Amino acid sequence: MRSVYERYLVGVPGVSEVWLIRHADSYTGLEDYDGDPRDPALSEKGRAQARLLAARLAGVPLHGVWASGAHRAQQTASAVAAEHGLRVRTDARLREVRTNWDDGRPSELKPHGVYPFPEPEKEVAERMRTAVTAAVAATPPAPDGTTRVAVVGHDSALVILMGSLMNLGWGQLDMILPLTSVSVLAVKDERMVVRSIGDATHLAAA
């Protein structure tokens, strides 16, 4: 009967938490899209979100911080890591789904919910899952209590990961992850379970 909470990773020894974080606001500070548009820094707004996120996470025990190689993810992760004495570790498997088609067009957003991206959903989920597993594997276990790892990534890849863990097809999990939102996973080896999704309540304060 409690094989149902073995699959829920509840009351199970050696469960780690992964706090999936969408990066903060970018496209560069809005004097104009002044810098290199291919890898923009956080905007002035995004820098403020990243501060509120880093303050909220300052109060939590944290044992590793990972990000994609995108500047906007790195800069969000760096604010978080600095509150804890951690390095940011980088993994290309956390990059956003490929959105541009090779023939010249961008990815549409059909209402139906047929998956619209040129990189297949199962590929995105597999690299995201592998990254999450590898990050936990790379983190020494917390001295007391739950090993916790922050992972800073990108909206569509994060939702694709969470939907795959929840057995929900593209667009069934009909929500948009806020910038600097926190979604918590529970991880025990290759078992991985969604605990919470999309919380950006630290943006309510300021």
Annotated binding residues for riboflavin, as ranges? 108, 110, 155
Q: Mask of contacts with a second copy, 103-142, x by CB under 8 A?
A: ------x---------------------------------
Please, which residues have CB within 8 angstroms of residue 38's CB and are 6 or more apart in sequence? none
Distance in Å, CB of 73 to a second copy, minimum: 20
178 binds, among Na ion, a second copy, none (CB under 5 to 8 A by kind): a second copy
Answer for the pair 125, 86: CB distance below 8 angstroms, yes or no.
no
CA angle at residue 126 from 125 to 129, to 5 degrees? 80
Residue 84 CA, chain-centre distance (Å), reads: 18
Residue 22 backbone dihedrals phi, psi, to 5 degrees: -75, 135
Burial 50-69 (b: 16+ CB within 10 A, else e): bebbbebbeeeebbbbbbbe
Q: 167 contacts which partner out of Na ion, a second copy, none, CB within 5 to 8 A by kind?
A: a second copy
Q: For Na ion, which stretch binds (CB under 5 A), given 69-77, 79-87, 131-139, 173-181? A: 69-77
Give the chain's largest Cα–Cα span.
59
Q: Shortest gap between Cβ of 98 and Na ion (angstroms)? A: 23
Displacement of CA 134 from its chain's centroid (Å): 14
Question: 41 vs 173, which CB is nearer to a second copy?
Answer: 173
Minimum CB distance to a second copy smaller for 112 or for 204: 204
**Pairwise CA distance, residues 167 & 76, whole Å:** 29
Per partner kind, with CB cut-offs from 5 to 8 A, the member of a second copy, Na ion, none near residue 19 is: a second copy
Q: Give least dist CB 69 to a second copy, A.
A: 26
Q: Which residues contact a second copy by CB under 8 A?
A: 4, 8, 10, 17, 19, 56, 59-61, 109, 145-146, 148, 166-168, 172-176, 178, 181-182, 184, 193-201, 204-206
